[PDB]
C-alpha cells in the first residue's frame, strides 16, 4: 500500500528562500516603482500574495507588456517610506511583518490598497489596543477611511462619550468636511449645550477659510437652532459675517427666534 509525506518546514523555507532571491534580484519578473525607489519582485509570488496583482500581470493590460508598475498617488508626497514598502513586500513573501507606532499608518495604506486583508485586519486589531483619549480622533479618521468598521465603532463611541473635551483639542479641527457633517448630524454625541456646536463650526471653517467657507451653509443647516438660547441667537449667531453673508441662514436664524417667541 501507499503513504503520504508532509515536509512541515517546506513551505516556510520555500517562501523565505524566494525572498532571499528577490533581495539579490534573482529570477525577478517585475519592477515595482513607488516614486520617481523601485523594488524588484517575482510575478508568481506577488500574484499569489493578493487578488490585486493577478489582473495586473495577467496579460489583458499595459503592465504585463511593460514589466514595470508605477504605483502613484499616495498620502505621503513621494510615496510611502521605502522601509515601510520593503516591510509590506517582504510580508507578501513571508507573512511576517513588524508594525511600529509609526509604521501602522503607511502599512494600513498599502495593506488596504493592495488588498492584503489579513495584514489590514492586524492593523485594525493593533489600533484597537493603542486606542486612547488622544489616539481616538486620529484613529477614527483612519478606521473611517480604510473601512475598519469594528474599530470605527469603538473609536466613534469614545469620541461620542468624550465629545465636550475632543472639540477642545486642535486634533478635531483637522477632520474633513464629510466627517464634521456626520458628527453634527450624529445624535448620540454628548456636549454641554447646542450653542457650543456653532462655536466649533465657526472655529473649524475659519482654519482653511479659502477652501472650507463653501461648506458652512450645509453645516449651519445641521445646527439644531431650536435647542439654542434666544439671547445667544440674537447677540452672537445673527451678527456673524459668515452668517450675515448668506441669506438662506438669516431666514433660518429668524424662524428659530420666531419659534421661541411662539413657544410661550
Amino acid at each position: 500500500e501507499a503513504e503520504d509525506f508532509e515536509c512541515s518546514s517546506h513551505c516556510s523555507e520555500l517562501s523565505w528562500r524566494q525572498n532571499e532571491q528577490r533581495r539579490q534580484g534573482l529570477f525577478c519578473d517585475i519592477t515595482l516603482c513607488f516614486g520617481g525607489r523601485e523594488f524588484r519582485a517575482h510575478r508568481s509570488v506577488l500574484a499569489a500574495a493578493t487578488e490585486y496583482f493577478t489582473p495586473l500581470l495577467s496579460g489583458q493590460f499595459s503592465e504585463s507588456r511593460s514589466g514595470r508598475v508605477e504605483m502613484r498617488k499616495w498620502s505621503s508626497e513621494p510615496g510611502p517610506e521605502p522601509d515601510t514598502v520593503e516591510a509590506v513586500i517582504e510580508y507578501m513573501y513571508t507573512g511576517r511583518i513588524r508594525v511600529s507606532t509609526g509604521s501602522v499608518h503607511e502599512v494600513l495604506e498599502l495593506a488596504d490598497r493592495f488588498l492584503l486583508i489579513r495584514l489590514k485586519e492586524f492593523c485594525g486589531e493593533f489600533l484597537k489596543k493603542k486606542l486612547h483619549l488622544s489616539n481616538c480622533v486620529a484613529i477614527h479618521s483612519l478606521a473611517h477611511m480604510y473601512t475598519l468598521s469594528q474599530l470605527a465603532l469603538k473609536a466613534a463611541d469614545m469620541i461620542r462619550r468624550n465629545f465636550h473635551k475632543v472639540i477642545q483639542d486642535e486634533e478635531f479641527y483637522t477632520l474633513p468636511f464629510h466627517l464634521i457633517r456626520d458628527w453634527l448630524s450624529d445624535l448620540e454625541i454628548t456636549v454641554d449645550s447646542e450653542e457650543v456646536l456653532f462655536e466649533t463650526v465657526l472655529k473649524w471653517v475659519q482654519r482653511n477659510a479659502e477652501e472650507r467657507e463653501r461648506y458652512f451653509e450645509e453645516l449651519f443647516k445641521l445646527l439644531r437652532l431650536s435647542q439654542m438660547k434666544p439671547t445667544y441667537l440674537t447677540r452672537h449667531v445673527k451678527p456673524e459675517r459668515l452668517v450675515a453673508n448668506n441669506e438662506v441662514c438669516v431666514k433660518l436664524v429668524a424662524d428659530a427666534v420666531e419659534r421661541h417667541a411662539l413657544r410661550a
Partner: protein
C-alpha cells in the same frame, strides 16, 4: 476632492468600461484604472461609482446587445445569443477587476450586488428575459427537443450552452432555468409522453410496452446528461414514471392475451420480472401487481393433492421474478391461508 475632480475620475473609468465593452482591453493600464476606482471608493464616492457602473452596463446591453440578439432572431439565434453571453462574461470579468477595491470595500459594507453579480442581473433582465427574447429562446430549445424526440438531428451543444447560461443567471440558483426552461419543458414533455403511451398501448404487447418505457427513461436520462442541467434527471424521469407507468398501472397488468395473468399462466418469468422492476418505481406499483395476482391465484386455488404443484410454481416466481419481495410473499401466503377457510 472637489465635485469636478471626482467627475474627472469617473469620466476616465466610464470610457475604460465602454472601451472594454467594445472589446479594446489592450490600451488600458490596470494600475491607472484601479487607482482611479480606489480613489473614488476611498474618498467615499462609491455610490457615484456604483450608480455609474449600473448605467454604463444597462445602456450597453439595452442599446447594443439586446438589439444584436433581436436583429438575429430568425438568423442564427442561439449562436448570436451565446456570443452575446460570452462577450459579456469576458467584459464583466475585466470590469470587476479594475473595480476590485469597490467589490472588497463598498459592495460588502453597503448591502448591494457585487460587480459580476450586478452584470449578471442586467444581462438576465435586459437580454435573456426580454419577453420577445425570453419567448423565442423557450420556443427554440423546446422545438429542438421535440424535433430530436421525433427523430431529427439537433445541436445538443447549443442546448447545453443555453442551459448553463440560464442556470448561471440564477445567481448561484436554478430560479431562471426552472421557470424559463424546465417548467415549460416538463409541461410539453408530459403532453408528448401521454400521447406516446396511447400509441404503444394500442399496438404493443405488455412486455414490449414495459421495454419501450425503460427505453424512454434511458433516453430522457441520456438527454439530461448531454444538454440540460443534471438537476432535471429526477423531474423528467418522474414525468415519464407518471405518464407511462403510474397513469396506466391497472391497464398494463390486465392487458388481454398479454400482461401479468397471461405471463403467470404461460410462465414467462423474466417478462414479469421486468414488470416488477418497472412497477417498483411508481407508488402503489407493486400493489397493483399483487392485487392482479391475488385475484387470479385465489380463482386458481379455488379450483383445487395438486396444491403442492401450485405452491412450488409460485415459490419459483416469488424468488426469481419478484426478488423474494416481502409484500408479494405475504400476498401469496395470504391467498394460501384463505383456501383453508
Amino acid at each position: 476632492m472637489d465635485e469636478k475632480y471626482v467627475n474627472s475620475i469617473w469620466d476616465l473609468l466610464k470610457n475604460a468600461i465602454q472601451e472594454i465593452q467594445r472589446k479594446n482591453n489592450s490600451g488600458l493600464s490596470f494600475e491607472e484604472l484601479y487607482r482611479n476606482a480606489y480613489t473614488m471608493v476611498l474618498h467615499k464616492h462609491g455610490e457615484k461609482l456604483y450608480t455609474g457602473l449600473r448605467e454604463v452596463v444597462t445602456e450597453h446591453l439595452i442599446n447594443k446587445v439586446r438589439e444584436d440578439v433581436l436583429n438575429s432572431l430568425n438568423n442564427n439565434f442561439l449562436q448570436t445569443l451565446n456570443q452575446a453571453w460570452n462577450d459579456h462574461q469576458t467584459a464583466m470579468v475585466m470590469i470587476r477587476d479594475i473595480l476590485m477595491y469597490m467589490d472588497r470595500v463598498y459592495v460588502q459594507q453597503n448591502n448591494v450586488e457585487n460587480v459580476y453579480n450586478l452584470g449578471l442581473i442586467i444581462f438576465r433582465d435586459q437580454v435573456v428575459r426580454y419577453g420577445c427574447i425570453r419567448d423565442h429562446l423557450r420556443q427554440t430549445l423546446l422545438d429542438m427537443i421535440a424535433r430530436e424526440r421525433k427523430g431529427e438531428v439537433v445541436d445538443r451543444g447549443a442546448i447545453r450552452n443555453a442551459c448553463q447560461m440560464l442556470m448561471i443567471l440564477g445567481l448561484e440558483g436554478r430560479s431562471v432555468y426552472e421557470e424559463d426552461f424546465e417548467a415549460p419543458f416538463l409541461e410539453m414533455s408530459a403532453e408528448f409522453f401521454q400521447m406516446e403511451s396511447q400509441k404503444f398501448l394500442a399496438e404493443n404487447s405488455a412486455s414490449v410496452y414495459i421495454k419501450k418505457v425503460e427505453a424512454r427513461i434511458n433516453e430522457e436520462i441520456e438527454r439530461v446528461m448531454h444538454c440540460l442541467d443534471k438537476s432535471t434527471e429526477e423531474p423528467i424521469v418522474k414525468v415519464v414514471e407518471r405518464e407511462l407507468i403510474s397513469k396506466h398501472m391497472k391497464t398494463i397488468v390486465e392487458m388481454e392475451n398479454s400482461g401479468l395473468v397471461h405471463m403467470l399462466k404461460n410462465g414467462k418469468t423474466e417478462d414479469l420480472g421486468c414488470m416488477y422492476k418497472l412497477f417498483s418505481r411508481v407508488p402503489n406499483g407493486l400493489k397493483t401487481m399483487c392485487e392482479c395476482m391475488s385475484s387470479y391465484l385465489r380463482e386458481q386455488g379455488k379450483a383445487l393433492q395438486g396444491l403442492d404443484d401450485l405452491k412450488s410454481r409460485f415459490d419459483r416466481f416469488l424468488l426469481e421474478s419478484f426478488n423474494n419481495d416481502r409484500l408479494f410473499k405475504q400476498t401469496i401466503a395470504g391467498d394460501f391461508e384463505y383456501f383453508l377457510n
